[PDB]
C-alpha cells in the first residue's frame, strides 16, 4: 500500500495473509485474500498460477505482521485451491483474476470469529456502490513502487470508485478494462495498492454493509496519475463463487 496508514488486523479482520512454503522449508509471502465464510478465503488467480499446488500454501487469519507472529492469529492449510479456468492476462490486464482457497487447520477445523477474525460479506448480484464512493484497501504490499522490501506491519488506505467511462479513456485504461473489473483511486493520485497487495480486499459500505466489492488485481505502476487500481468485480462472480463453494 502506497501512502495510507499502518493498521492492525482488528480493523480489517477478514484479511488473509497467504504464504508459500519452499523446497527447503523457507516460507515467503504470496498475496492477500479475504475471508468470505469460515472455511473459504477469496483471492486472485494470478497469485497462484505459476505454482498451482495447494499443498505449498499456508493461510493466516488474525495476523497483523508479515514476518512475525501476532497474538490472536490462526494458521490454516489449503484443502482446495480453486483457480479460474478462464484466467488470462494480456501485458497489463488480468482477466478472471479470482481464486478460492478452502482453509482447514491441522486439527481439521475452519475459522472462528474473534476480535481479530471475521468474515466479510459479498455484494448481491451486480450490486456495486456509486462511483465516487470511498472504499478501503489493505495489505502487506510495497510502500513505494521502487522499494525492494515489504512493510512488516499491515497497512490500509482509502480510495474512491471511478467510472468505467472515466477509467476507459485512452489516458487511463481504455478497453483494457472489462465489465468484470472495477477501478478505484485517490482523487489526488497519492495512495494506491502495489506489488504484494494483490488478492486483497477492496471494501465498501454498500447498503449498510461492509462489502467485498473488489479484489486487488492489477494496474500500471502504483499511485500513478490516470492509472487507477483495477479490481476483480466481485458482484459479477457470484455464480462461480456459489458453485465452487
Amino acid at each position: 500500500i502506497i501512502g495510507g496508514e499502518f493498521t492492525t488486523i482488528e480493523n480489517q479482520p477478514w484479511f488473509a495473509a497467504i504464504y508459500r512454503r519452499h523446497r527447503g522449508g523457507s516460507v515467503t509471502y504470496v498475496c492477500g485474500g479475504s475471508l468470505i465464510s469460515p472455511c473459504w478465503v477469496i483471492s486472485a488467480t494470478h497469485c497462484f498460477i505459476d505454482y498451482p499446488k495447494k499443498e505449498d500454501y499456508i493461510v493466516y487469519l488474525g495476523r497483523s505482521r508479515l514476518n512475525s507472529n501476532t497474538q490472536g492469529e490462526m494458521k490454516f492449510e489449503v484443502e482446495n485451491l480453486i483457480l479460474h479456468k478462464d484466467y488470462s492476462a494480456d501485458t497489463l490486464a488480468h482477466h478472471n483474476d479470482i481464486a478460492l482457497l478452502k482453509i482447514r487447520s491441522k486439527e481439521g477445523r475452519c475459522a472462528q470469529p474473534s476480535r481479530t477474525i471475521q468474515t466479510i460479506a459479498l455484494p448481491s448480484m451486480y450490486n456495486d456502490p456509486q462511483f465516487g464512493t470511498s472504499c478501503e484497501i489493505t495489505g502487506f504490499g510495497k510502500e513505494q513502487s521502487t522499494d525492494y522490501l515489504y512493510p512488516e506491519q499491515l497497512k490500509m488506505t482509502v480510495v474512491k470508485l471511478i467510472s468505467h467511462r472515466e477509467c476507459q479513456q485512452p489516458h487511463y485504461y481504455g478497453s483494457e478494462v472489462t465489465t468484470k473489473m472495477l477501478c478505484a483511486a485517490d482523487p489526488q493520485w497519492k495512495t494506491d495498492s502495489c506489488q504484494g497487495d494483490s488478492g486483497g480486499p477492496l471494501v465498501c459500505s454498500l447498503q449498510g454493509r461492509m462489502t467485498l466489492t473488489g479484489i486487488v488485481s492489477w494496474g500500471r505502476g502504483c499511485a500513478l496519475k490516470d492509472k487507477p487500481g483495477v479490481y476483480t468485480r466481485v458482484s459479477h462472480f457470484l455464480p462461480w463463487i456459489r458453485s465452487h463453494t
Binding site: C31, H46, C47, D50, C194, D197, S198
Partner: peptide, 17 residues
C-alpha cells in the same frame, strides 16, 4: 532477475513480462 521467493510476482509493479 526475480526468483521463486518473489512476493506477488505477477502483481502490479512487478518485473514480470
Amino acid at each position: 532477475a526475480c526468483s521463486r521467493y518473489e512476493v506477488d510476482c505477477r502483481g502490479r509493479x512487478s518485473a514480470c513480462g
